[PDB]
From TrEMBL, chains B, C, D:
<feature type="region of interest" description="Immunosuppression">
    <location>
        <begin position="39"/>
        <end position="57"/>
    </location>
</feature>
<feature type="glycosylation site" description="N-linked (GlcNAc...) asparagine">
    <location>
        <position position="83"/>
    </location>
</feature>
<feature type="disulfide bond">
    <location>
        <begin position="63"/>
        <end position="69"/>
    </location>
</feature>
<feature type="glycosylation site" description="N-linked (GlcNAc...) asparagine">
    <location>
        <position position="102"/>
    </location>
</feature>
<feature type="region of interest" description="Fusion peptide">
    <location>
        <begin position="1"/>
        <end position="16"/>
    </location>
</feature>
<feature type="glycosylation site" description="N-linked (GlcNAc...) asparagine">
    <location>
        <position position="76"/>
    </location>
</feature>
<feature type="coiled-coil region">
    <location>
        <begin position="98"/>
        <end position="128"/>
    </location>
</feature>
<feature type="domain" description="Retroviral envelope protein GP41-like">
    <location>
        <begin position="14"/>
        <end position="128"/>
    </location>
</feature>
<feature type="transmembrane region" description="Helical">
    <location>
        <begin position="1"/>
        <end position="19"/>
    </location>
</feature>
<feature type="glycosylation site" description="N-linked (GlcNAc...) asparagine">
    <location>
        <position position="90"/>
    </location>
</feature>
<protein>
    <recommendedName>
        <fullName>Transmembrane protein gp41</fullName>
    </recommendedName>
</protein>
Amino acid sequence: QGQLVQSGATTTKPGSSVKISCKTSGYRFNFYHINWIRQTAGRGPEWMGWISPYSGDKNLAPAFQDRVNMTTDTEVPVTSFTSTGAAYMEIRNLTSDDTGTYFCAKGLLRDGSSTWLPYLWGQGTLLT
Amino acid sequence: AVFLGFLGAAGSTMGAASMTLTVQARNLLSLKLTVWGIKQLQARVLAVERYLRDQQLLGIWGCSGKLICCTNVPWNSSWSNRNLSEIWDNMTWLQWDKEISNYTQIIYGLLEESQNQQEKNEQDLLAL
Amino acid sequence: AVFLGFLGAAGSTMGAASMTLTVQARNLLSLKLTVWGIKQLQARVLAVERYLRDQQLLGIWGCSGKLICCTNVPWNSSWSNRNLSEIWDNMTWLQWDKEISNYTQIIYGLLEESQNQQEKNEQDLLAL
Amino acid sequence: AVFLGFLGAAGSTMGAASMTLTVQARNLLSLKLTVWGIKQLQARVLAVERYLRDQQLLGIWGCSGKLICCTNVPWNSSWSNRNLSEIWDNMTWLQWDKEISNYTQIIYGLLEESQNQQEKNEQDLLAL
Amino acid sequence: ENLWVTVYYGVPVWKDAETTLFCASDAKAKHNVWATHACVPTDPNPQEIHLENVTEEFNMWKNNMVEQMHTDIISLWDQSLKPCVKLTPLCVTLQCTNVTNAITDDMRGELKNCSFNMTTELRDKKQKVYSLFYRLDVVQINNKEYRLINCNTSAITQACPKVSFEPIPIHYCAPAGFAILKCKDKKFNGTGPCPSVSTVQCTHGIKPVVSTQLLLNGSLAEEEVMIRSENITNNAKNILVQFNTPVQINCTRPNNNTRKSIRIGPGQAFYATGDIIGDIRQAHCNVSKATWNETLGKVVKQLRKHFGNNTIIRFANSSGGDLEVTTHSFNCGGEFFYCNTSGLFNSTWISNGSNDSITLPCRIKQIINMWQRIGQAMYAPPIQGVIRCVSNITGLILTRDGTETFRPGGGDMRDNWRSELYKYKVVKIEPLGVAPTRCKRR
Amino acid sequence: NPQEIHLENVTEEFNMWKNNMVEQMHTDIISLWDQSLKPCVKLTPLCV
Ligand SMILES: *[C@@H]1O[C@H](CO)[C@@H](O[C@@H]2O[C@H](CO)[C@@H](O[C@@H]3O[C@H](CO[C@H]4O[C@H](CO)[C@@H](O)[C@H](O[C@H]5O[C@H](CO)[C@@H](O)[C@H](O)[C@@H]5O)[C@@H]4O)[C@@H](O)[C@H](O[C@H]4O[C@H](CO)[C@@H](O)[C@H](O)[C@@H]4O)[C@@H]3O)[C@H](O)[C@H]2NC(C)=O)[C@H](O)[C@H]1NC(C)=O
Ligand SMILES: *[C@@H]1O[C@H](CO)[C@@H](O[C@@H]2O[C@H](CO)[C@@H](O[C@@H]3O[C@H](CO[C@H]4O[C@H](CO)[C@@H](O)[C@H](O[C@H]5O[C@H](CO)[C@@H](O)[C@H](O)[C@@H]5O)[C@@H]4O)[C@@H](O)[C@H](O[C@H]4O[C@H](CO)[C@@H](O)[C@H](O)[C@@H]4O)[C@@H]3O)[C@H](O)[C@H]2NC(C)=O)[C@H](O)[C@H]1NC(C)=O
Ligand SMILES: *[C@@H]1O[C@H](CO)[C@@H](O[C@@H]2O[C@H](CO)[C@@H](O[C@@H]3O[C@H](CO[C@H]4O[C@H](CO)[C@@H](O)[C@H](O[C@H]5O[C@H](CO)[C@@H](O)[C@H](O)[C@@H]5O)[C@@H]4O)[C@@H](O)[C@H](O[C@H]4O[C@H](CO)[C@@H](O)[C@H](O)[C@@H]4O)[C@@H]3O)[C@H](O)[C@H]2NC(C)=O)[C@H](O)[C@H]1NC(C)=O
Ligand SMILES: COc1cnc(-c2csc(CN(C)CCCN(C)C)n2)c2[nH]cc(C(=O)C(=O)N3CCC([C@@H](C#N)c4ccccc4)CC3)c12
Ligand SMILES: *[C@@H]1O[C@H](CO)[C@@H](O[C@@H]2O[C@H](CO)[C@@H](O[C@@H]3O[C@H](CO)[C@@H](O)[C@H](O)[C@@H]3O)[C@H](O)[C@H]2NC(C)=O)[C@H](O)[C@H]1NC(C)=O
Ligand SMILES: *[C@@H]1O[C@H](CO)[C@@H](O[C@@H]2O[C@H](CO)[C@@H](O[C@@H]3O[C@H](CO)[C@@H](O)[C@H](O)[C@@H]3O)[C@H](O)[C@H]2NC(C)=O)[C@H](O)[C@H]1NC(C)=O
Ligand SMILES: *[C@@H]1O[C@H](CO)[C@@H](O[C@@H]2O[C@H](CO)[C@@H](O)[C@H](O)[C@H]2NC(C)=O)[C@H](O)[C@H]1NC(C)=O
Ligand SMILES: *[C@@H]1O[C@H](CO)[C@@H](O[C@@H]2O[C@H](CO)[C@@H](O)[C@H](O)[C@H]2NC(C)=O)[C@H](O)[C@H]1NC(C)=O
Ligand SMILES: *[C@@H]1O[C@H](CO)[C@@H](O[C@@H]2O[C@H](CO)[C@@H](O)[C@H](O)[C@H]2NC(C)=O)[C@H](O)[C@H]1NC(C)=O
Ligand SMILES: *[C@@H]1O[C@H](CO)[C@@H](O[C@@H]2O[C@H](CO)[C@@H](O)[C@H](O)[C@H]2NC(C)=O)[C@H](O)[C@H]1NC(C)=O
Ligand SMILES: *[C@@H]1O[C@H](CO)[C@@H](O)[C@H](O)[C@H]1NC(C)=O
Ligand SMILES: *[C@@H]1O[C@H](CO)[C@@H](O)[C@H](O)[C@H]1NC(C)=O
Ligand SMILES: *[C@@H]1O[C@H](CO)[C@@H](O)[C@H](O)[C@H]1NC(C)=O
Ligand SMILES: *[C@@H]1O[C@H](CO)[C@@H](O)[C@H](O)[C@H]1NC(C)=O
Ligand SMILES: *[C@@H]1O[C@H](CO)[C@@H](O)[C@H](O)[C@H]1NC(C)=O
Ligand SMILES: *[C@@H]1O[C@H](CO)[C@@H](O)[C@H](O)[C@H]1NC(C)=O
Ligand SMILES: *[C@@H]1O[C@H](CO)[C@@H](O)[C@H](O)[C@H]1NC(C)=O
Ligand SMILES: *[C@@H]1O[C@H](CO)[C@@H](O)[C@H](O)[C@H]1NC(C)=O
Ligand SMILES: *[C@@H]1O[C@H](CO)[C@@H](O)[C@H](O)[C@H]1NC(C)=O
Ligand SMILES: *[C@@H]1O[C@H](CO)[C@@H](O)[C@H](O)[C@H]1NC(C)=O
Ligand SMILES: *[C@@H]1O[C@H](CO)[C@@H](O)[C@H](O)[C@H]1NC(C)=O
Ligand SMILES: *[C@@H]1O[C@H](CO)[C@@H](O)[C@H](O)[C@H]1NC(C)=O
Ligand SMILES: *[C@@H]1O[C@H](CO)[C@@H](O)[C@H](O)[C@H]1NC(C)=O
């Protein structure tokens, strides 16, 4: 199973800095990375970056090297293998050219060569 | 290296914990009749009984003194249709036993007769 | 198929009962000090003792974890001059033990040193 | 021949006593709660415990049912710089244990992981 | 694709189970009732292995370690009182007067100077001896005639005075093939999924202290002051609070008593209370009014989380019951104190001293009855000298009534062991694991 | 057939004054007496 409910689809104007929320369920939030993916209209879909809800280690694309702040809070144990988490996304020098639908997707596996791969996605949020 | 200790890889992936089997293997076995003396004697006879029941099953499968023995019983996908990468690089041994628990008795018989017939075949091959 | 149960082939021919060995193998092993509690504790320590005496002899013969192991001790016809067809397709394991009972201690020594010398030969062969 | 009896070669050279291992191997294992009854029950549970602790170590080394098993752990000369002829044709097993006593715990770990890794290598070789 | 069953021996998977837990203790050598000399010595390196990524379910209110310790402690007492003197001849008509009048009104009668005829080493010759008995251990007949309190209900057995009632920390251990799981969550409730888990072979040192209302010499919380009840919304489920700061208590029986051996027969010797050297004073306990007021406020704050920031909670004294449950009953140096606690639970707190302490008037019993079965009781032999013990109060045992009111109690002995065994859980190892891979024999 | 096996070339250290068999027999004999005198008559009326 697993769900990733995302925040609201409100809009702002250039120069601001919005926060995107992604709430997880039905799976251990600490066992998989959380990826942030952007599907702009004037560009192909771009991978922004993933962060580790377990180690706190983050890794993003150099196109978002010093413009994006990725943070996650600790999980809440529901059962032995179920917890609830949250992931946050921010932008710095923000304009209106970054308009599009934003998604959050958890990692694929816990080990191997396709660990962080965006496997389970959210419903997306429309922006400015 | 790592050395997580006894049951240290209980939250690790099945492929990771499958490399620290000697850790759990050696801790499976190591007179006045007072209230504490009767208590300790029960702890002693119980440990040897539980240890030898597992060594008995390990014997009627042709796995004596083996931490990892391979069998000839093919994997009926009705037990678990999961792939190898989503098992050894994903699940933990705890939750794996949770979903394979129904069929653990079915498998224990297939391994029992596959060894009885194999030793009957080996005697026929050495009869010449 | 058949599956005669525990000791179900006790009246069957030696060759027939020699195919249902796992049936008898798995049933060889599976605190308040009251008159029933002392009784049950004795039943527990006795079962593990009898089980391990047979596993000990099975070990000093090079037959660990084997239901059917072949040895190098030739059959002295003074033990039983009967042929194979009049043993496996005729006698039962009960009456066989009845006529081989005198020489069961003689055989238990020949298998014991044949294994001690074999492991001494195997070490000499792996010394190069 | 000779047959010195149980522990008969305790004063013999290590190479001589290494040929009478079955003698000591078979003597390692062969309810009213009175002062004698409690005494005898303790003698019974103690014997099976001591016997199975040695069989456990013999198992996590890949030496199940072996009187003489060869390993892959090389002899660190810091344990004993003595040569083979001045060990097997000179020392006794008693005085040998007296000078190897410090490093007996170091060796017991090297044999434990050499078997854990060997069975991991054997599974990889039979995966094709 | 080509997948076969592969057996693994030694897989880290466990199931919940109930098993017999043996005791471990530390080297100290007289002998205590808890027979801590009969336990296996504890390792000077108590190994704890942290179970990373593991989240386990706990339930202290179904835990079996508290049910096993509850019966072990009772068995340890039955075993120790087995070879001691049966004081059946003490059930005889007692001629009692007050000892040394002119103290403070109803206080001369709190302890009596009782004389009675007693058997000797010869069965045909009697002796007229006397002994000092407390008022709580005698009842009238209706004249100054008295009898021991227990004679119409229970036989009596005095403790072998060489045994020590001093609690010694006990380490419960799991047999080989089993494991003890510790919930290392600093703000753990007692039930539910515990995120941080570690495994241990033996539990920490657990002193088998049997107190009432106030939990003495126990383990402390690391954060806040937790509150544990299975159904907190149910008023009939005892609340087990646990402080993070120890509020010290100082108890004493200042009377300098004397023990007079009286031979009631061949080998049998009943130890009577000879007289009192010096002043006949009152046994009591001190607790710093400042620290008790501060620590009583922390309980109020944590009680607001279950009843609202706006509600008002009130502390009242015990609402009745047996003597052991209406008072802070416990054991201090051998004598069994029974401390009135009205001065500790007499406070109402709104929605939102500093020098002296509050003293606790304690009475003393000698014929203490059994907490489980009826028809059995123990005679605590008199302790010579002055008794004064210093101990920590680490928790309480409160009770709601359904704006809010909380009174203490708790005659159940296993509630004491829940306060120390809440973070532990027994599991059995199942080292057999079958799983698929592309490996095949031969 | 009380089997005795001679340990040729073996020289062992003994110490009867630290031997535990004498400490174990000392308590076994006492336990054998405590056990046997357990069900017998208590002559307490004889103290007259
Ligand atoms: C408990 O549970 C958690 C969560 O499930 C487990 O954490 C996960 O562990 C697995 C395996 O250990 C991880 O998979 C690996 O991922 C790395 C990617 O990280 C690398 O890249 C980072 C960014 O580029 C880099 O910063 C790292 O470098 C160091 O920095 C971090 C800083 O925090 C430090 O923590 C690291 O340890 C590094 O020292 C890092 O290099 C990837 O490289 C791995 O691939 C290699 O290994 C696999 C086999 O594992 C092999 O097949 C490949 O070919 C390659 O060689 C591997 O994919 C995963 O990222 C972790 N986090 C998750 C899943 O969120 C934890 O292990 C569990 N512990 C226990 C005890 O159970
Ligand atoms: C208890 O003890 C009794 C008596 O000792 C055992 O009974 C004997 O069992 C053995 C082996 O099972 C039998 O030997 C076999 O004999 C058959 C001959 O029978 C065939 O021919 C019949 C007439 O032509 C025919 O009617 C049969 O067909 C069915 O009908 C009967 C009706 O009763 C039915 O009962 C049968 O079961 C059939 O379903 C039958 O086909 C012979 O065919 C066998 O040879 C084959 O098998 C051997 C190996 O066993 C193999 O080597 C050959 O190459 C060939 O493939 C075999 O010789 C014997 O006849 C039985 N009766 C006796 C000895 O009197 C009984 O088994 C014991 N049971 C237990 C649990 O111990
Ligand atoms: C207890 O401890 C003692 C002392 O350590 C041990 O005694 C020693 O035993 C070893 C091995 O058994 C001996 O080594 C052998 O030495 C012989 C040399 O003796 C031969 O030559 C003699 C003179 O020429 C001759 O008299 C002997 O013939 C008989 O006569 C004597 C009379 O007493 C009789 O006792 C003998 O038994 C003979 O029956 C004898 O032939 C040598 O021949 C040996 O070499 C052969 O064997 C080795 C393998 O062992 C092999 O590698 C060679 O190639 C060759 O085939 C061997 O070197 C030693 O001499 C003994 N004495 C010492 C060391 O002082 C005793 O064994 C220990 N017993 C136990 C139970 O522990
Ligand atoms: C005192 O309690 C006892 C008194 N007397 C016997 C007894 C007599 S004879 C016999 C043997 N008899 C023949 C076999 C069984 C009977 N059969 C004939 C059926 N056993 C007891 N045995 C177990 C006892 C307890 O554990 C117990 O209840 N405590 C003990 C600890 C405290 C305690 C502390 N600190 C405390 C007490 C008062 C206030 C505050 C704290 C609470 C109560 C126990
Ligand atoms: C409890 O009551 C008993 C009486 O039943 C007290 O015992 C008696 O106490 C008196 C007063 O001390 C004793 O008399 C004294 O005798 C000595 C010795 O001759 C004499 O020098 C004194 O002047 C005085 O007369 C009496 O002997 C004694 N009797 C017995 C049998 O002990 C007891 O003291 C009381 N105890 C307490 C604690 O109140
Ligand atoms: C809580 O724990 C403390 C500390 O373990 C206990 O204090 C101990 O109390 C006993 C008796 O009350 C003391 O033994 C006494 O020692 C004095 C001085 O040597 C001696 O004169 C007495 O005859 C008796 O042996 C013990 O020393 C003392 N320990 C410490 C460290 O102060 C306290 O009793 C416990 N309270 C409860 C309710 O369990
Ligand atoms: C044994 O005697 C005592 C002493 O009278 C009894 O305890 C009293 O019980 C009555 C109720 O019937 C109470 O009102 C008194 O307060 C009790 N006296 C006390 C506590 O000192 C006891 O009930 C008697 N037991 C039996 C079985 O008859
Ligand atoms: C009363 O509480 C104090 C404070 O926790 C205890 O003192 C600590 O005891 C532990 C256990 O040995 C030590 O690790 C700490 O270092 C001690 N701290 C201080 C400041 O002393 C004290 O032992 C408790 N008393 C009793 C009788 O339990
Ligand atoms: C309690 O009373 C006893 C006597 O009943 C006191 O014991 C005396 O102690 C002094 C100490 O200086 C000794 O010199 C005496 O020899 C002791 N007398 C006896 C009869 O033992 C004891 O000191 C008193 N305890 C207290 C705290 O005052
Ligand atoms: C209980 O008694 C103890 C000791 O009898 C008191 O602790 C002493 O406090 C004074 C404070 O002036 C210190 O100087 C001493 O060193 C302390 N003694 C010990 C052994 O720690 C404690 O204050 C008393 N508490 C109450 C509430 O009466
Ligand atoms: C991300 O936001 C948090 C908010 O507290 C801040 O502490 C942190 O420094 C930010 N990250 C970076 C890289 O500035
Ligand atoms: C799997 O098992 C079921 C019964 O459990 C059996 O009917 C089926 O034939 C099996 N299939 C395979 C492929 O083993
Ligand atoms: C195992 O059997 C139970 C029986 O109620 C069933 O609920 C559960 O789904 C089964 N699990 C699997 C994996 O078949
Ligand atoms: C058979 O055993 C006897 C002694 O039991 C022996 O004398 C004889 O040589 C042996 N024969 C064969 C062929 O093994
Ligand atoms: C076994 O020995 C007994 C001893 O009296 C003898 O009667 C019997 O015939 C012997 N059996 C065999 C098969 O040698
Ligand atoms: C021998 O062991 C020591 C430590 O006990 C180690 O430092 C050394 O490298 C080892 N040498 C060899 C040749 O194994
Ligand atoms: C073993 O260690 C002890 C420690 O004191 C030392 O005295 C002794 O020489 C050591 N023996 C060897 C063979 O290293
Ligand atoms: C004990 O003193 C009280 C209070 O003065 C008195 O009521 C009672 O009668 C006295 N008892 C005896 C036996 O003197
Ligand atoms: C002891 O018995 C006598 C009868 O001989 C009686 O007069 C006396 O009052 C009794 N003593 C007590 C203390 O009851
Ligand atoms: C105890 O705390 C857990 C923590 O999640 C909670 O789920 C549970 O409802 C609490 N129970 C009570 C009785 O407070
Ligand atoms: C707790 O008690 C209340 C009433 O006292 C009841 O309504 C509720 O169902 C109880 N909770 C549980 C879990 O039984
Ligand atoms: C509780 O306090 C009231 C107030 O005077 C008192 O009457 C009552 O006896 C007290 N109860 C207990 C058990 O101390
Ligand atoms: C407890 O003390 C209060 C006053 O301190 C008093 O009113 C009450 O009666 C006492 N309770 C008992 C049972 O003595």
